[model samples]
Target: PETRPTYTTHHLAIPSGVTQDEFDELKQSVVEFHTYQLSQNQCSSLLAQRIRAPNDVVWSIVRRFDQPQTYKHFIKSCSVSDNFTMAVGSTRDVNVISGLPAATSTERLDILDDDRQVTGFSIIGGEHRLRNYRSVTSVHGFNRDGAICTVVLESYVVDVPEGNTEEDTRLFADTVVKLNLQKLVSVAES
Candidate 1:
């Protein structure tokens, strides 16, 4: 009997030269991503990106709430607000590195789950464009060897800029996932 949940998945391209059995198993093991209906009070966007890495590796990177460098492309730096390490109530301040003039935000770690490999956080203050932003990120482990994982991010914002739409927000979210996942894969592979 397996001790952990085993799941497998693939994306635009398989790692490099995984295996035929792995490829076949990946194609068959798929977790469907779902969409949420935005509330009248806020707009919401959700995205899921699957990566090939060990389950423990993925969970470690995801649970390190204070370490954005492991999976953040835009964050120039991030620090814990309360002096203590990451916890349910710990807050984090981030400096975003966009070509724009300035960007920054503060987020509170709302939920942290170990058994389910799930976590959630919300933006409390920031120089960002949106209002009332909250995000939930979760990881699902798959495959016999437990080297494959899928990461899903569900985000919501009160309102975007005048010209911004939910699609734009989702695009931004996906871009973050792409870049961050790149970093994750690189580190996990190494």
Candidate 2:
């Protein structure tokens, strides 16, 4: 029997902290980008391009680091738009969308006799996708120990368009699945 293709989106939150200066810098960058996006009619490609331009800055600021040891840790999460779309005929196709990352709530505790209690907490992750995929989404839980953290979410969309070749469909499905699997493996290794 042939198996039908399907897809869904997932989301997760990882915890992190940064020095006051670093946090301020990040906020400034986001505000500037938001202004740029608002000025354009549709800037998905442009936004993606801008994000990819500064490879090191983009990843380092967003990616998670080992907890308790690294200067700060980050949370990572994602989600899909829909479940699956049945392929009918040519021209019309269904699309699966993924939600952007989100930050979870946190609590603060104070230690006695610490001279001065530490003060800081924040959700350090992207919000663009979250705002875009507003209709449907999901959030995965994270695991954290002191400063270390890990988050996981599984969501995807399935598009079925008319006139789509079997080969094309297979290729698309294979690519997404493989890419996601590779990401999961990499995270596990880290």
Candidate 3:
């Protein structure tokens, strides 16, 4: 049997108390940086092609606006595999609910907790999702020209819906990208 491509999923939660305008500005900066990177690299694709996941795009953009070497360490910590698959859609994976614990104030932060301590965690809001995976295979950090970046990878299943369409996926992807960028910008400015 042929081997399937494996892709890593990363979720980046920005710190609270940032303004919307700041977030939007930071996002725009990242977008501009991505364009510059593409031009500098001389890649034919106008968009950042190496950003396979939503978090990938967010971190890449954030690194551009942040201080030097901060993003470089984060990118180095990610798990790269040729067997990964990429898609965009709005369908929620029901399986994620199964893995998640009951919602609470600490839901988001709860997910970050494990047998091992995770460094560089600033503020954990609450427990939002239950991570059913046994272990995270790897964790890495990046510093893009001085801005800090972090990435983690683990083994788990993501239940993508059966009827999910590509167009729907793209919309969700684009929305998330913009939203995250906005959030990050807000934080940076505040």
Q: What is the C-alpha RMSD of each candidate to the true structure, in Å?
A: 8.9, 20.9, 16.7
- Per-prediction TM-score, please? 0.69, 0.21, 0.25
Q: What does candidate 3's lDDT look like per residue over 38-117, in tens digits?
A: 11111111111112133444443342311212332212122212542221111111111123453322111112222222
Colliding residue pairs in candidate 1: 7-142, 7-143, 53-147
- The reply for model 1, stretches above 4 Å from the true place, is 1-37, 145-158
Candidates sorted by lDDT, best first: 1, 3, 2
Scored by Cα lDDT, where does model 1 land? 0.60
State the lDDT of candidate 1 residue by residue for 22-105, as single tens digits. 444443222232222345434554444556676677778878888877676878888775566667988887888878876678
Q: Could you give the candidate ranking by TM-score, starting with the highest?
A: 1, 3, 2
**How many steric clashes does model 2 contain?**
28
Model 2's alpha-carbon lDDT is: 0.25
Model 2: per-residue Cα lDDT over 1-190, one tens digit each: 9955322111111113223433333343223221221211111110011111122222332232112112211324222225422221111111223343334322111111112111111212232222221110111122234332222111222233345543564455445433443444343433
Model 2 poorest ten-residue lDDT run: 43-52
lDDT comparison, 1 vs 2, better candidate = 1
